[PDB]
Design a binder for this molecule. Sequence first.
Ligand SMILES: [Zn+2]
Ligand SMILES: [Zn+2]
Lengths: 107, 58
Amino acid sequence: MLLFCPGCGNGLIVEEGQRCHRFSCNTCPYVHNITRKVTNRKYPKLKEVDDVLGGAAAWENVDSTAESCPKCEHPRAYFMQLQTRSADEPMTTFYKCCNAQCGHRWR
Amino acid sequence: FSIGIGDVTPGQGLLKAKYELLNAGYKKCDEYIEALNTGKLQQQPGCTAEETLEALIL
Ligand SMILES: [Zn+2]
Ligand SMILES: [Zn+2]
């Protein structure tokens, strides 16, 4: 991330000093000792999973005492939650039922 | 051998069926628009959702 000097407002660079790594200006004496953990997360966009889950994928989210699907009232359905974009998104819930003489897609 | 305006004029059996077809097609198009904008639209494979809407409307 860009961080700028309170004095002159040039762009800081990271360098190493005699006790710590420092943010330092190139044109004025201002330096800032990195005393503790500092971070910057990108969170990029992941791949689309819409066609990845269709067609009997290797799902695993099913559990004992899981709810039956609301239409068929049988537990013959898988359900999963995934982030569709980056992992700061709250996970969405979705489910699909596949039974004899019964094909449907639900949300 | 001649052609006139009586030869391209539509009868009654067309003017009923055209009205029924336009009403049915515009209802199904409106339901697809509503299924995209404010709900779930079943995305066709290999494309975005708007291209699915374009394909269904065409
Ligand atoms: Zn500076
Ligand atoms: Zn089923």
